[PDB]
Amino acid sequence: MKLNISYPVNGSQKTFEIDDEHRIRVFFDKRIGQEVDGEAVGDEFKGYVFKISGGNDKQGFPMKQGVLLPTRIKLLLTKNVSCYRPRRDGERKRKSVRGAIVGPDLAVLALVIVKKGEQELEGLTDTTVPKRLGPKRANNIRKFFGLSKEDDVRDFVIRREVTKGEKTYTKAPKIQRLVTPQRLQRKRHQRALKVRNAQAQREAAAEYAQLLAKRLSERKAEKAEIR
Amino acid sequence: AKQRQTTKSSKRYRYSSFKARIDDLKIEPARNLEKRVHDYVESSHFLASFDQWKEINLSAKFTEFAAEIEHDVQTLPQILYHDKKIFNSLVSFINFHDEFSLQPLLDLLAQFCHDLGPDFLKFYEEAIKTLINLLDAAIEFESSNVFEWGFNCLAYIFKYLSKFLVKKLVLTCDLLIPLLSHSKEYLSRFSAEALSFLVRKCPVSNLREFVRSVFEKLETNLYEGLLILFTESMTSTQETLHSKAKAIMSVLLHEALTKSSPERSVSLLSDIWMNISKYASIESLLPVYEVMYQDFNDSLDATNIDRILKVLTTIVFSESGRKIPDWNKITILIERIMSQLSQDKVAFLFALFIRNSDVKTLTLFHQKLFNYALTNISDCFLEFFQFALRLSYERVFSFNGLKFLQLFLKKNWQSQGKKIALFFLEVDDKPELQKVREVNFPEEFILSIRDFFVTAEINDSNDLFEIYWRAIIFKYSKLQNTEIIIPLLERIFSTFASPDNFTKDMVGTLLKIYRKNNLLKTILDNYENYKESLNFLRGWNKLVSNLHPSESLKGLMSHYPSLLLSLTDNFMLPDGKIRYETLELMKTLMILQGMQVPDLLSSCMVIEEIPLTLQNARDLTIRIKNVGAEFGKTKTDKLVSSFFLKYLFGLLTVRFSPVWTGVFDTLPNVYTKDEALVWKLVLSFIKLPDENQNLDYYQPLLEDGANKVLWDSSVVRLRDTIDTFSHIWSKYSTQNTSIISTTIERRGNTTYPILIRNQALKVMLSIPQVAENHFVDIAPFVYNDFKTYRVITGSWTEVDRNVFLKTLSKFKNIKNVYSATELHDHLMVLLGSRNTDVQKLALDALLAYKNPTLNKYRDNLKNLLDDTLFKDEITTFLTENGSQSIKAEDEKVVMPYVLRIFFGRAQVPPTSGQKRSRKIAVISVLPNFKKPYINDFLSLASERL
Amino acid sequence: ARGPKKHLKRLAAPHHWLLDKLSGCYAPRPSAGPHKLRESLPLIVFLRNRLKYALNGREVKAILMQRHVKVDGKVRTDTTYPAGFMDVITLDATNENFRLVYDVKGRFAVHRITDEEASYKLGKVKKVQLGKKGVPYVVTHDGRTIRYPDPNIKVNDTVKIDLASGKITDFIKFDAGKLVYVTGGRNLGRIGTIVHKERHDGGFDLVHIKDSLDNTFVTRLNNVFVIGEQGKPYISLPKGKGIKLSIAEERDRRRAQQ
RNA sequence: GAAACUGCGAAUGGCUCAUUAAAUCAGUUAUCGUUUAUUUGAUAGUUUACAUGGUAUAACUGUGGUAAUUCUAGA
RNA sequence: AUUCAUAAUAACUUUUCGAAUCGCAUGGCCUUGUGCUGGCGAUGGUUCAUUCAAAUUUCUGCCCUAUCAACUUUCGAUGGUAGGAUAGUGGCCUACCAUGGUUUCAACGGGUAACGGGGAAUAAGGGUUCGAUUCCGGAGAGGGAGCCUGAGAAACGGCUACCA
């Protein structure tokens, strides 16, 4: 079966077609998350460690973690699970999914390089893929560059250059959770609003109390007159 | 903002801010070509507009105004006879400032002036005063339309009273000064446009009076107001100038060069020229060009020589030389100016000429251009040549500027030696100025400074400074410099055994002088105190790279076997460059010594060369991991082990997160090579923030050199270049402070990041067993509470302490540490900290001690820490006679932890209903405790007091 | 239905809006608001079918988004905002203030008022009760809650609310001899003076009202709105002064003025 | 300003009369027997801060399975 | 009319809320600091009230059939007590209790080509018949069964079984 091996440190990944059944059989009976020794797979993988993460069968159905069977089964999938994207809020769909036990009928098996062996793979270890995007939140920028609190993130924003024909310029992200005078003004206005509300309520309560006391006094006077 | 609504959406209705409307608004009624009501008249303009406004506006104020004035406006003669009452009512209703009714009133006011123009003159002053109050009132309540109505009415009055107002425009301007000088930019801008129409209509004779008055006024926002007013007057249409622009420019010019006019007037003229030059095309500007050039020729004089010079700088800089048709004319003007002043102005002029002039003209005049610089700018030629290099260095070289610099060096040689040191000091770093370095020097200095070098007293830093600037020049010397340098070298080592920061830099400067073995011996005699300095390393690197290997050098290297190891200490420094030179330096010593360079050294050098960017972020990580794998795989000697491990800690000092990932993975698998060394490196980094690192460096005698190099300009483009020129001038004015400051900038970095302790803590966490063995050195921090120190000078951050406590819990046998009981007691102190996370960390370390009784109750103690299960655990675990209650035999051991835990929970700010209930619970379990155990809790509360 | 409805058929719309039965199939459904659906006049009907200022719904929306309409001194931008009885509608650009008062026929009438009259409205006290923290409050017929009411104010009284500040200026007690306005039943829109209030515990109270012409009619208390003392209303009344007039005389005076 | 996340709507409208004989429905009551998005009005000084995390992912980059679907696996 | 509104005391909570949000604009104080303060709006948030609604509910009112006279109650039928569940009342369900409840004033059962009404036709009046069908209300989405989401669904141009 095909093997989709990913080296996450480099972010690289490549496929290997397999014909001999010895490596395929040492892959048999394993489970997603278990580790296998690359040398059993082949000399090119001597010294490597492969973690099983999933795969697809001869009919394309994916493997699902948590179901411990070597055969397909129809499972009722919901929000926030693999192998299913709900179209409608609260939607649940029962779909056939392959079990988590490796078997002969797996068309492709996905592997993650846990540890690098003595030899270097041409397409995985020898190449690197840069990250597509850089940090956006201010604290993430500081963490990435190890900046101090006094140092301003504004000067350490990663900028990417774009050329359109002969024209050229640069683009940078919008930081969120950046301390700006507008946020301070909003906080101050909110505090002032709440304080003023409290004072107004106290004044109104006091005036009502005075009115009640005056009415109470005059009615008591009238009762005294009646006596 | 900066990306204004250039691309409009498909929405039919869009929101627009008041500032947006104001910015787009422009006061010029004539451009509007829409049909106007007053164009068609049967009786009068006022009546024609009066009936229409009755139809459209229904405001209460306008309705009241209409009724009062309806009867008296039926005919033009009736309006004339009743003009007084009509104007009073119009003024009265406008003062109410009712926006619903302003538009009809303001329009009618203009049409009122239209009917009886010459008669309106007696009303003129009141009408303008009313508008000024309205526009001032309009600032309070936002409405862009109100401003549009008001200023168009002002513009209309100007159009109808154009003849009379022009005769006394100075009076009209006098009324509008509050508007032209108002704080708001737009109110001044709008008024300027309205007054601009009158100016373009003026006769030349009347204009000359007006320009004189405003320039007299110029001697807040008035300068900007005049700037907008005049530039609007000349500009008529896109890439085109008004026909009258010739006379206005000529009249503005003649006054500006007139001695009586203030210098601000010429600067005002300069700012005008930038605006119109930018606005107008070449063809529209040709007629304007000739009038100045003729006037400059006609009015050239000694008194106005500076003023003409300043405006000429304005022309050359404006849009570079693109707008200038014929540079040859300017060159003739420049020659006439030189034949008939301020040095700085010319330096600014010629430098811009070099950059902006066409190639053909400069070829004809480059030779005369530089000879003039030697003629008068020879006093400040260095400031000039620097500015010329910054503007266009390549052009200066092409036109033989270096040769003239040689002549300047050989002409003004004695008076400004130190300035030459500053200039050549600044230009070394730039590679493009390599040709300037290749310039040969006049020999007479190289004898003179050498003569002082042969007999120089060095007993204080002040004496040392004298050699430094002479040393900087001496590098270009060709007269066998090595023989002279060496005697000074032994002198400086002998006189200052313990160098300061400044002394180290000079030694590198002195080494930098050397050009293609004894001097190698001299540096080897005293290098332990100079390895850290970057300049010293660079000079040493240039030396050894120059020397060719031979058996004699092998003997020199043999005499000092500890050389290689000592240099390894540099790899812990916070500076990338210093490490790189040490790597380059270390390699060539291996060539001179003949010992084979390990491949690890080459690989580490490559890593330093890789830029620190997100694109290269991953690439850096693999390289560090790969070399680490190589280092672990291949057995090596102590030097390689000392090399690589120190280099790894150097990578921690780097401020790039990907670098940290590689080293943090590499170090735990390679520390076994030298466990003692790695601990020393970790220990040092922990103590670096506590250690106070201050760069103490010589301060030369302060120089009071400062002056206004150039005039101030409102336009940003000219001002920035002026600031650049002045910065160079100020730098050269104080040569001692400039020379000394430049050295500081290029010295390098010595201040470790304050977080460096955190990096070492991560290393310690990854390898607890090393910390456990070496607990002796790390013990004091716990007993000091991680506070330097009764007032506390500094203390560890909360994150740092948290990582520290993790390491303690990870020790395999905490019980057998150097001071277990004292650590155990202090872990008691942390167990009761108000922060529950600290308490959990302390408990984990306490559970690291193997005690059978505590293990029996390990779960209950943990549950007490957890906020969710805190309440139920108290009732089940601590209830007297409970099934799960602590046994009496084990009560002695567990109870102190229980009491101290509850103490921390008791310190929570009892601030929310859940939190308040928590404080009530912790006090309510006290009666369950025996009285001796109740007593100790009270003691714990009183211990802090 | 599985939830709240959002459409209103023209035939099912309130009769007093006077909507064409063939203009379309649907009528404006008043959104939730101060007044009930059947006792409210949406702004679209008022601006289009009554004032004729707008020719269709879209133009009404254009007017509203320009923020030219104010209800009780507040700008409203909802086409189907349920303006109702004793509501003040202010148009500054046109300079009018309208008070929504039923005519004798039982329909909301275009009644223009002065600014000083537009500064205040009237509210029937639907409820009085102590709120949280022991703060008394009164709920009026238009959903306004006013805290710290005058203690003498009780249910069925009328309170003069100042729009700018939303506070009670004066009040009228519900007593015999008071001037009242009918807001329901086939006597809707009439005006008279209270004569007697018949009470039935556990049932609907009945009120006898005498007009200026000496005619008497009985109406449930829920449809009575005190508007002042006899001869001294606190608001300007529409033409006809809430007097019901017969059909024959209607023919008569139409002929006379014609 | 595509895509995606987020919020709202999709329980309105339109169609048909199968079941249903105190059921539906009409009129007339009650909630002191309860839920109520939204509108409208009131209503909260008692709760590193110049502002916290991934305990995190989509869109996106890239490697793939299935004959096939508004299928989706690994990184 | 209330154990109502509200308030108070003592504790309780895998226990909430009490603004880490956004647009436009740049005013006022000064000890001149990117110091302090400050405007017009949007979106959220506890509780109360109002509104749109929902749920249940009190009384009266349905065509033919007595050659349908007794029905309901074992497996809730009538009612009491306690609990569970419900947004909530309530045999709605559970456990223990009693033997109750409707009926010749037609229960119960059967038929209905029975969705109900506003209305339509005819007639002199009484009546007879029609009303799927422009509005109101109820039920459904081939037939039964069960559900996530959401304020609101037992939704079907949402999901899951079984039957065809």
Ligand SMILES: [Mg+2]
């Ligand atoms: Mg952009």
Ligand SMILES: [Mg+2]
């Ligand atoms: Mg009642």
Ligand SMILES: [Mg+2]
């Ligand atoms: Mg969504």
Ligand SMILES: [Mg+2]
């Ligand atoms: Mg049927």
Ligand SMILES: [Mg+2]
């Ligand atoms: Mg039946």
Ligand SMILES: [Mg+2]
């Ligand atoms: Mg019934």
Ligand SMILES: [Mg+2]
């Ligand atoms: Mg909504």
Ligand SMILES: [Mg+2]
């Ligand atoms: Mg609200």
Ligand SMILES: [Mg+2]
């Ligand atoms: Mg992923």
Ligand SMILES: [Mg+2]
């Ligand atoms: Mg019960």
Ligand SMILES: [Mg+2]
């Ligand atoms: Mg039972």
Ligand SMILES: [Mg+2]
């Ligand atoms: Mg029928």
Ligand SMILES: [Mg+2]
């Ligand atoms: Mg029907």
Ligand SMILES: [Mg+2]
């Ligand atoms: Mg349905």
Ligand SMILES: [Mg+2]
């Ligand atoms: Mg069908």
Ligand SMILES: [Mg+2]
């Ligand atoms: Mg269904």
